[model samples]
Target: DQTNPYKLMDEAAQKTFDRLKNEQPQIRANPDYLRTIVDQELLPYVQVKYAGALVLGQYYKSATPAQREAYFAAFREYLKQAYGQALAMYHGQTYQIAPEQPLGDKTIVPIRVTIIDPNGRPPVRLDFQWRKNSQTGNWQAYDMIAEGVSMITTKQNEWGTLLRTKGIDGLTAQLKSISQQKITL
Candidate 1:
């Protein structure tokens, strides 16, 4: 059921926005609630391990198995924080998803989205990259490209030096800290 990237995107956005819409009061009272929403509603369909591996770049090949597993865990939580922070900027903006393309036997798919502002500004485009899990037959989103910038690339660029100098554990700890940071509206 979740194998179709188009259906996945549509349902994901609908569920996330619906929760945000319904929980407006609680969110305003405690912005950290956003993290819970992201963790429960969004991350379920996001392939964080692959994205983490990309962020780790060359460093991933040398990491211990335990370290690699821990990195995935921490990276997933880090996304909850990062995405929750991004969602804090949501202000009744309307979103539109592009029509689905023919899926054939492709392993990865890109879903385009348009974010329309309520204040009369120009719309922003976002592209979500979804990957098909060979074992699970599920389509999971891994990265988002906004305005020609790729999320995984940006994270790699931002964290490359740290991973290179401090090693996987160091990077894992850094991601943990970032994920545990307080969330505010």
Candidate 2:
């Protein structure tokens, strides 16, 4: 579709990378800054809409209106906590952006981020699929491939199967458990 997915990704990536770069220093100076960045920039980009829905599973279909509302609220907070914990793990890391790949109607952009480890190598390859939002005329990230694993597909497969077997309540419990974990952040 679009030839330069990089153009769309560039701004967001630069913003995030720059903020994260600054955060490294801030985190060292004041650990609380890490939480602030995660709550602000990172959480907005993450596909929280889908993640929240996924956790609801079939319960989404059967829940009362209030139940659905409560579930979504809990799911959002859960994701925030989960992301905060994940972000906290990155102390000194560097991110490199690769050339964008064409996907006919869309584009696949690769963002390679590696942690600066004195002991060993710690690299994380994250690919973001950006699709043109026709209504907004802006590119929005729809999926991510992390460490060669598609986050969307993995979550769908894992959560979908769980929904089929255990129903929506079960999925809610599973996600809640993850959220309740004692995250260092």
Candidate 3:
């Protein structure tokens, strides 16, 4: 509002970054606290439902209404818990924007960011994939690729195996347990 200086991904990222920086202490003090904030404030800006479907793959396409509801809820919580834990480890690292690969005519936006470690560790590059919500002008992240590995794709692989081997009941239970405890991220 005050002479905005950023657009597209930068505008969105700067908004998220500024909030994270301003509330670092409050957000990092407790993992549960961070979880709540991410659920309330950040998750809405992410295409979590779409990501959930991707993680579920064929299961999502074939699930009952109840299964769809339960699965997505648990999946969302699993992400919130893990990401919140990661957020708690913020140490003033710098995030730099990189040019995104062109997408022709898709609503998908892949915003690359180089994370400059404050502790002098080697920089990590990540691509946060966002998609426009047609109903709203909001851009929401659906996936992240770090060092060539896609987070959602990796999880899809792992959980896909688990779901196939253990069945939906087992997979759903495992996801539920993750959100219900303080497991390693």
What lDDT does each candidate get?
0.84, 0.59, 0.67
Clash pairs for candidate 3: none
> Candidate 2, which segments miss by more than 4 Å at Cα?
1-5, 24-35, 54-59, 101-104, 107-122, 148-166
* Candidate 1 structure quality by residue, lDDT tens digits, 1-185: 78788998999888987788788888899888898998899888887888887788888888889999999999888888877876765645788999988988889898988888888899888788999987877898998777666756766755878877899998899899999988787
Q: Which ranking of candidates, highest TM-score first? A: 1, 3, 2
Tens digits of per-residue lDDT, candidate 2, 1-185, equal 23355665665556655676666767766655655666577555555666566445456777777666656666666665555555565654565666655545543334544434556676665666555555554455545555655534556777787878876665667666766665563
Taking all chains together, each candidate's TM-score versus the true structure is 0.87, 0.65, 0.76
The residue-level lDDT of candidate 1 at 169 comes to 90
Tell me how candidate 2 scores on lDDT: 0.59
Candidate 1 — number of clashing residue pairs?
0
Clashing pairs in 1: none
Candidate 1 ranges beyond 4 A from true positions: 134-137, 148-150
Model 3, runs deviating above 4 Å: 1-8, 100-103, 132-139, 183-185
- Clash number for candidate 3: 0
**Candidate 3, residue 151: CA error in Å?**
3.7
Best by TM-score: 1
Candidate 3 lDDT over 1-185, as tens digits, reads 21111245566556555666677676546547667656665576667788887777666666678877888788888878765655554445688987645555557667777778877998877677777665654556776676776646766667888889976666778888978886232
